[PDB]
Design an enzyme around this catalytic site. Structure first.
Site, short mmCIF file in Angstrom:
data_model
loop_
_atom_site.label_atom_id
_atom_site.label_comp_id
_atom_site.label_asym_id
_atom_site.label_seq_id
_atom_site.Cartn_x
_atom_site.Cartn_y
_atom_site.Cartn_z
CD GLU B 170 -2.93 -1.20 2.24
OE1 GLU B 170 -3.18 -0.10 2.80
OE2 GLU B 170 -3.51 -2.27 2.52
CD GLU B 354 -3.95 -7.30 5.31
OE1 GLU B 354 -4.21 -6.93 6.48
OE2 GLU B 354 -3.21 -6.65 4.55
#
Lengths: 457, 460
Positions: B170, B354
């Protein structure tokens, strides 16, 4: 300024909805000549007098005066179709009809004389009736050749007069209107999803093939597809409705995905499998589709739709037109962004407008006119949303107001629901003088064009 | 069979969230070593004993045993990060730390010995503290160089042991977590949007650069980005809400668009002008971004979000979603929706790296006398989400695999706590650091084992 300096401002029609002269200069019959009640109505065995498309608005003979009006509004673009049955009356001729080609030569010349660029829809629901009755239209792959012959003829002929071309007006309209749209004269009850999708496949391959031919003919040509823009919203944040809404949008996205990306999209397999559709590919098809995709995407936009997973709905947040259609200007910004996000290629809004039964009435200045503040308001709100989309970074080539001079409608073949900036005095029964009148929206729109949109603010 | 034969099944952790051994074998301090309260908490001047990450779950030492557990579940993939500070303790050394490289060689070797492919996140919130202090992290362009130094080093070393790499977990984390995510030392109130977006630009350039380098080193490497997936829904069909929802999603799409498409997207111009953002490009930046774009997009997914143009008439609760004990809403269909949104936009393979359910699992003895966790809530969560993955596969979305987050209970990023557990494997250590650190198969262990070994067929 928000609007680009090269932005194209204009109006749009289809040949069959305006020209008339259905029997003149060797023109063959089209499907529209047997559709007195329009796309939603049944076909006649032979043309009947109550079919308003026989005369239309007589644009075929009146085009110079009309074009004078377009010019006074300041159009730099005018969209119309070349009527297939004027160039190839039956469609199977070895040679084109020269009087047809000459007519369009004159039309385009007259347009250029006023500083107006032609934008040409190659096929707009105009299929020669002979091809429809003989082959059942686009369900037959032979149509590709006929269309090719048509396209080449005109691409070559007009190659220095027409920069902007569209291949088909909504290939997928074949699904609802097989006859009007695909020239398919088999009764709707007898058509499987398979036959309809196969017909659209032939159209998509033809669009590609004609894109190849176009590029060989003039490398300056811009070739777009033309699709129906209908952004969908979920009735609620329930993930089941969000997904229903996504699935609904895929129905439409399938065809634009072929046009732009050049292959049937990943989700097509499932849909086809669930609907018993198996496309039969000719060996050349995949490569034509993949290698010749469109330069730009053009679309019609009228309204959004609200979808649900419940066994669409009426959006409580939207206003409705006097005619009974809901109105959604923000939906235009939404769909411009959705298309641009997805494809990253220039967009062209080629059909937008407000239909109403305009009444011609003398203003206090003694001039016969239509006081259409409703149409001014519609256009203004929509164009402000176009401005928002330009600021969002979306590439937008231009805007052509639909039925810019009142025309016969596609769905009902009527004149009383009017989209135009120019009122034409002719009625549903065929009566009237055919005189033209400026609506108040004529003057407003003139102002928008001449200011390149700055008057919107 | 509806799942591809080559589908990757596994679990995912980050190094700092498991390894412990924070000072061992020449390791330098990372930013996580001074975050005893996690990314949401304050930094300490020096590591403090109350920081659970110092010992973590001690995966550094116990990884052979943990991996035997992974293998009993049938994992063919396992995702972790290489801790940057084990390789370049300060970050600026001329030569790498050989004890660290040796450690990852051994880790990857055990993995392959059990038939598990490594999936390596190059930078997961572990920036060497020396770099964060000295340069204030990614606001300084020198980070590109250091990151490059690091990545080349591992890309070369493991070129035959690791096929799948992620550049950053990210990049846009920087916006919320400048220190944890960007190594950015500067007090949060002193950071402009301009600085944060500039740091992110540095990261994106670095991601492309490392993509170029990876391709030079091994043409069989697959390199991917890692973004937060958060599908958004309008609260009502009001087009104002629909547009608000679109706008919201662009905040996220900006970064994935650079990763995949290779240029700052069209709507970025307007957003930057409205926010006083002007990116400073080096001369080679634009072409680097354009020419080196990721092979695949990987993402975390937990939940959707609902948006309104006017929230005060009611960041909103979705009436139709169930919620976890811990209090997050749950949205499996949202995973199908976001898989499709990404694939519609980018048309490249996706990787779910995830996903999971956090809960305070209770270790308690069952009827068979075995200490375990009766985690049927977790089984239900995973079942429903994986059924939505199956829908997406039928939708024609290309999906490389699925790695359950925190497959062995790990220290959390946000709070640096152990009590909120994601794992299929319970680890006995508590928020205060106490416990045996022994491992226990949860009920979900056996179920997930059956899912993997049937290649998803048991889901139906």
């Amino acid at each position: 300024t928000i609007f680009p300096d090269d932005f194209l401002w204009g109006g749009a029609v289809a040949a069959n909805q305006v020209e008339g002269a259905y029997n003149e200069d060797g023109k063959g019959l089209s499907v529209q000549d047997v559709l007195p009640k329009g796309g939603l109505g049944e076909a006649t065995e032979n043309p009947t007098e109550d079919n308003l498309k026989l005369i239309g608005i007589d644009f075929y003979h009146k085009y110079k005066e009309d074009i004078s009006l377009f010019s006074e509004m300041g159009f730099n673009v005018f969209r119309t179709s070349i009527a297939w049955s004027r160039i190839f009356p039956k469609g199977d001729e070895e040679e084109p009809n020269e009087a047809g080609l000459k007519y369009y030569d004159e039309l385009f010349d007259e347009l250029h004389a006023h500083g107006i660029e032609p934008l040409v829809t190659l096929s707009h629901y105009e299929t020669p009736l002979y091809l429809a009755r003989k082959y059942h239209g686009w369900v037959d792959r032979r149509m590709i050749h006929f269309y090719e012959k048509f396209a080449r003829t005109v691409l070559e002929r007009y190659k220095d007069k027409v920069k902007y071309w569209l291949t088909f007006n909504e290939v997928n309209s074949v699904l609802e209107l097989p006859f009007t749209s695909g020239g398919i004269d088999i009764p709707k009850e007898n058509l499987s999803k398979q036959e309809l999708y196969q017909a659209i496949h032939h159209e998509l391959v033809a669009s590609s093939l004609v894109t190849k031919i176009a590029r060989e003919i003039n490398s300056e040509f811009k070739v777009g597809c033309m699709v129906l823009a209908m952004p969908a919203y979920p009735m609620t944040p329930n993930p089941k409705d969000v997904w229903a809404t996504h699935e609904y949008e895929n129905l439409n996205y399938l065809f634009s995905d072929v046009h732009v990306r050049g292959y049937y999209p990943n989700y097509a397999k499932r849909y086809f499998k669930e609907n018993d559709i198996n496309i039969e590919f000719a060996a050349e098809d995949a490569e034509l589709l993949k290698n010749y995709t469109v330069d730009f995407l053009s679309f019609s936009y009228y309204m959004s739709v609200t979808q649900s997973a419940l066994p669409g709905l009426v959006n409580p947040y939207l206003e409705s037109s006097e005619w009974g259609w809901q109105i959604d200007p923000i939906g235009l910004r939404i769909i411009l962004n959705r298309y641009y996000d997805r494809y990253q290629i220039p967009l062209f809004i080629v059909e937008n407008g407000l239909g109403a039964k305009d009444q011609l009435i003398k203003d206090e200045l003694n001039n016969l006119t239509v006081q259409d503040d409703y149409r001014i308001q519609y256009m203004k709100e929509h164009l402000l949303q176009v401005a928002e989309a330009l600021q969002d970074g979306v590439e937008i080539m231009g805007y052509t107001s639909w039925g810019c001079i009142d025309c016969v409608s596609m769905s009902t073949a009527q004149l009383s629901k009017r989209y135009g900036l120019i009122y034409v005095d002719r009625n549903d029964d065929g009566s009237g003088t055919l005189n033209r009148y400026k609506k108040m929206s004529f003057t407003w729109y003139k102002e928008v064009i001449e200011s390149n949109g700055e008057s919107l603010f």
